[PDB]
RNA sequence: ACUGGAGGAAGGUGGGGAUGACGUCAAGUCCGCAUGGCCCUUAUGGGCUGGGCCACACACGUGCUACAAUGGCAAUUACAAUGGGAAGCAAGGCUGUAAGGCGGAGCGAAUCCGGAAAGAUUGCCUCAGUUCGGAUUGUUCUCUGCAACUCGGGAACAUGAAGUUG
RNA sequence: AAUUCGAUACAACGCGCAAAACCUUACCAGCCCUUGACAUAUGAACAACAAAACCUAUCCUUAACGGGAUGGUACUCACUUUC
């Protein structure tokens, strides 16, 4: 939901730290629970149903700030070739631009990069 | 009564920006001297329909044409006799 | 001098002209362009102008280059009144 | 003090800004807006009774009620 | 098990936990939709009597309701021309006074020869 | 008598004030109410007079009351907690987060 | 109208209007 | 260096959708505590702007151009780090003042010609 | 001693302590304030009465409001704060008709008029 | 009951709203909605563009502007309230004679946004059809929209109908 | 060719209108459609155990509706798919 409201935003992108790192918690809290691991293992061969139903009943995934990477790649590629000599110039604005606005949906803002792609290989 | 509204809003939910502030891109900008008609006229001649201006946005209870207020959707009608019969929040007599 | 009009606001002033989308076709036909500014590059055409009925015939002259195409059309046809 | 004057160099200005530096009209204002395609689209909002078999098939049999009812005096819409 | 159906529909269609509970009101219709749903069957087939139809609201219905006041109207029996009114009345039969509920909501149903309507203007005993 | 880091609190509503509602933060109650307008008219024709109108208004209500300062571990104690918490309105609880550098 | 009144009354901005007019004067001295 | 934040939690009133005002993040800092050299926090306050509390000390970096609010919190930080950087070059500008203003009057600043021509003995 | 008065949607506070002579309204000097043409006199009546003007001290200030309600509100501060002597002054002033508000706040619009009174004209 | 008088901030329904009987007038609207009955059922139905709803010898109605010098204008200065803002309100800087344009601190809004007009200070006018009066009335332009000749506003600058209290 | 329609003493005529470029719109002409945009049942039907349609996108003609393709996406033992 919202943070631990103890650190701060610690992203830098980083990584996911996978599964089976609850050694940790059992170090932490495994202090009430019993003396198996293939407890913990069907944990996980369950989890694996709770994903589903996470993902179901939760949301389709949002992904990160490497949007504006794969954007920027967008518009480098709707150019795709050295044509005008200002088409680039403006794919580079239309990019640094239509990354602002903090509604237009995630997914038209790269579908308008494929659509200059588009008419400009029409063109 | 709506029949027809309806299929032009979602027309225009069909040519949507994705096409239409697309056909829009090179219009402002100035040194793609390059016919600016291929972003302007043999493609942005969207068939006369599927516009914003050309939405009335109608009311949804009876479906009076105009005098909709764009808040709750109905008209002046019924949102008067309405919120008289209840079932409207909080809108209350203005008796200051 | 009104060619030369056109010429000076080609698009050194921003809005451009905005013709009415059937500018890509032949010229001389019934044109219910209706709000179509009129198009310098295509004066002295004998073009017949808009028909929803009674297309009212107009020769494209150097004089008409700002206006709308159907510059000769005039609707509100009432100036008329002896009791 | 010219370090009053050299201590401004500031154009870069990190906070993501669009820059124009002679100001020709410029399509960022035509993607500034939050979209206009679906929000005003979607505006008839929807009766249940497009569910419930229980008030369909039964308003349905009431029109045809009718039918029925002016089929009977022949008055009704032929073809 | 209908509530179970509701909370199967509505729920689907909105996408929210919700909680459908109904409650037997035990002395029947002392609201005014319901009287008014319910004068408005008797007056659907068959035919029936508007001074009966005040002679069972005499008969069941006066515990300590303040008063009731009845308005119909419609095309009425039976010359079928000339539409008019009716309306009876009671003890205390009041609205310009305040801090009164008084309940209120009308109904339409019809008999082939256009529609006739009824309004039900119910009041309620206060500081019980 | 003031608060630094805090979760506040602000309710808006049509009836706040008095619901048995969860009024045990320090600092109770203030509002600001605002008023809205709306009159349209009498009649239900669409034949006639401009002339008569009745008038209907909107009156939102908006209560604050301040969290004390629940700190790294009470901030999310009660976060949970509330999470869902239900009242029968809308209301907003605001954080102020210090992390050091 | 024309005057600074008329532009005001009619609710646009002429040539005895502006409301950076009113800034520019000061920045300018 | 301890920071202030804010950042909204306001209910969805039941219609199972986003609220508007959620992405909002408010970041304060204060460049008296973040102990810099006068310069570049002078050149760090006009880079800012009218984002800066003056009366008291107060950096304020909010981009609600991001969705959700762990793209605002790490948005935060970025900005951040970035304007730190491009201040901390004011130091070294103000250095390189110096070094002109020096220059241009050690030379005509008489009796300094000894060395500008014992720079030549030693050529 | 401190008073407060409004009048016309203007509210002016006020502050009396037996000085000598200040008047200062926004702390501001308040012939300047309210400009010469008037409202002088009007603020001055209240005290050419069993005072030679030479004894008392005013600290105020006023918002909201005109040119006649500001004055009104500032002159029934006064006339509020005039309790310095407290059961000896009201004896004074009530006479005069120094101590009531004007009652007259402005009478709203209602419908179907152009005014409170004012009406279209049938024929 | 009325007349005063008292206190009081409010004196006699303090002010305002809201609230509006029987009923009357075949009042209004089947063109909101609902509805009886009567007609069309390749049509009076559905959709598309054009064009019309904006005209004019003509009278009547409502609203606006003023014929002035209690004033017209230019520069100075003073004081509101409601409100409105995400197809959004946008400070500042820059740009345009300006309308406009560039971009944007903040703000889903007791926090971000919004030169009040009168009025006042000086000066010009000095009584005119005028620096009062502004319709008609040229060129450039621009806002939107896909689209401004018949068929939306907006600015620059020139022309200046009638109008002297009807 | 339309200058749409309802309002008609106080109790109509800046009235429905809280907003006529197209749209709004009934009114007028061209442009067509006719189980129709829309709804049930309707099986003669067609067959798909995945076809067809159908729809995100490309092209072309129509003053516009469309329409013609043309990919691709996409599927239901129910096809809205057909008259």
């Known amino acids: 939901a919202a943070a631990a409201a103890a650190a701060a935003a610690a992203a830098a992108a980083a990584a996911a730290a996978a599964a089976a790192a609850a050694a940790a918690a059992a170090a932490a809290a495994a202090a009430a629970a019993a003396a198996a691991a293939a407890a913990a293992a069907a944990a996980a061969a369950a989890a694996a149903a709770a994903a589903a139903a996470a993902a179901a009943a939760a949301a389709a995934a949002a992904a990160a700030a490497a949007a504006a990477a794969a954007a920027a790649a967008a518009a480098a590629a709707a150019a795709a070739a050295a044509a005008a000599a200002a088409a680039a110039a403006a794919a580079a604005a239309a990019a640094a631009a239509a990354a602002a606005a903090a509604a237009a949906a995630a997914a038209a803002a790269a579908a308008a990069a494929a659509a200059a792609a588009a008419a400009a290989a029409a063109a | 009564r709506n029949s027809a509204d309806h299929r032009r809003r979602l027309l225009a939910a069909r040519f949507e920006l994705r096409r239409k502030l697309y056909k829009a891109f090179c219009k402002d900008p100035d040194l793609p001297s390059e016919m600016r008609d291929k972003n302007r006229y043999k493609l942005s001649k969207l068939p006369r329909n599927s516009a914003f201006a050309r939405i009335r946005n109608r009311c949804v209870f009876t479906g009076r044409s105009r005098s909709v207020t764009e808040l709750f959707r109905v008209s002046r009608i019924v949102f008067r006799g309405l919120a008289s019969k209840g079932a409207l929040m909080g809108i209350t007599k203005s008796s200051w | 001098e009104n060619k030369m009009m056109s010429r000076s606001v080609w698009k050194d002033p921003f809005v451009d002209a905005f013709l009415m989308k059937k500018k890509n076709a032949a010229l001389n036909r019934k044109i219910w362009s209706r709000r179509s500014t009129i198009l310098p590059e295509y004066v002295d055409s004998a073009v017949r102008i808009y028909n929803g009925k009674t297309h009212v015939r107009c020769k494209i002259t150097e004089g008409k280059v700002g206006h709308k195409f159907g510059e000769f059309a005039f609707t509100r046809k009432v100036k008329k009144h002896a009791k | 003090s010219a370090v009053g004057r050299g201590v401004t160099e500031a154009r870069a200005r990190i906070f993501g800004h669009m820059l124009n530096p002679t100001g020709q009209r410029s399509p960022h204002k035509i993607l500034r807006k939050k979209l206009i395609g679906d929000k005003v689209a979607e505006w008839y909002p929807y009766d249940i009774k497009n569910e419930d078999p229980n008030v369909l098939a039964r308003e349905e049999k009431e029109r045809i009620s009718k039918l029925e009812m002016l089929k009977r005096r022949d008055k009704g819409p032929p073809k | 098990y209908e509530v179970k159906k509701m909370r199967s529909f509505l729920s689907n269609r909105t996408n929210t936990k919700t909680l459908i509970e109904s409650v037997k009101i035990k002395s029947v219709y002392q609201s005014a939709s319901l009287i008014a749903q319910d004068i408005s069957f008797q007056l659907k087939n068959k035919r029936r009597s508007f001074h009966s139809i005040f002679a069972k609201i005499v008969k069941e219905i006066p515990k300590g309701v303040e008063g009731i006041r009845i308005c119909f109207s419609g095309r009425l029996k039976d010359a079928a021309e000339k539409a008019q009114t009716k309306c009876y009345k009671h003890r205390k039969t009041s609205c310009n006074v305040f801090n009164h509920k008084i309940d209120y909501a009308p109904v339409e149903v019809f008999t082939r020869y256009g529609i006739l309507g009824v309004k039900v203007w119910i009041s309620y005993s206060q500081k019980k | 008598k003031i608060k630094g880091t805090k979760i506040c609190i602000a309710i808006r509503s049509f009836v706040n004030p008095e619901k048995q509602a969860w009024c045990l933060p320090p600092h109770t109650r203030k509002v600001a109410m605002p008023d809205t307008r709306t009159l349209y008219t009498v009649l239900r024709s669409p034949h006639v007079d401009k002339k008569s109108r009745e008038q209907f208004e909107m009156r939102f209500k908006k209560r604050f009351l301040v969290i004390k300062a629940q700190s790294h571990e009470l901030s999310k104690k009660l976060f949970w907690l509330k999470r869902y918490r239900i009242l029968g309105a809308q209301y907003e609880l605001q954080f102020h987060c210090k992390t050091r550098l | ?29 | 260096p301890i920071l202030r934040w804010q950042s909204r939690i306001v209910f969805a009133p039941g219609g199972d959708a986003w609220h508007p005002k959620n992405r909002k993040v408010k970041m304060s800092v204060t460049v008296k505590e973040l102990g810099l050299s006068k310069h570049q926090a002078k050149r760090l306050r006009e880079l800012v702007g009218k984002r800066y509390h003056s009366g008291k000390d107060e950096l304020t970096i909010t981009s609600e151009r991001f969705e959700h609010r762990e793209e605002n919190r790490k948005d935060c930080l970025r900005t951040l780090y970035g304007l730190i950087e491009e201040a901390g070059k004011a130091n070294k500008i103000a250095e390189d003042i110096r070094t002109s203003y020096v220059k241009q009057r050690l030379r005509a600043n008489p009796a300094f010609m000894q060395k500008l021509q014992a720079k030549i003995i030693r050529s | 001693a401190y008073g407060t008065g409004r009048r016309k949607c203007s509210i002016a506070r006020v502050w009396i302590q037996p000085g000598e002579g200040k008047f200062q309204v926004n702390e501001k000097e308040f012939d300047v304030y309210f400009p010469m043409l008037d409202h002088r006199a009007a603020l001055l009546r209240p005290l050419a009465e069993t005072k030679t003007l030479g004894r008392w001290d005013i600290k105020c200030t006023v918002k909201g409001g005109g040119t006649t309600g500001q004055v009104g509100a500032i002159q029934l501060g006064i006339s509020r704060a005039l309790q310095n002597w407290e059961p000896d002054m009201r004896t004074s002033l009530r006479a005069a008709g120094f101590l009531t508000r004007d009652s007259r706040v402005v009478e709203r619009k209602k419908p179907g008029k152009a005014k409170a009174r004012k009406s279209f004209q049938w024929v």
Request: net charge positive; no cysteine; aromatic share 6%.
């Open chain 7, 1 to 29: 109208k024309k005057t600074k009144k008329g532009k005001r009354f009619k609710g646009s901005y002429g040539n005895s209007r502006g409301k950076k007019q009113k800034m520019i004067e000061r920045i300018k001295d």
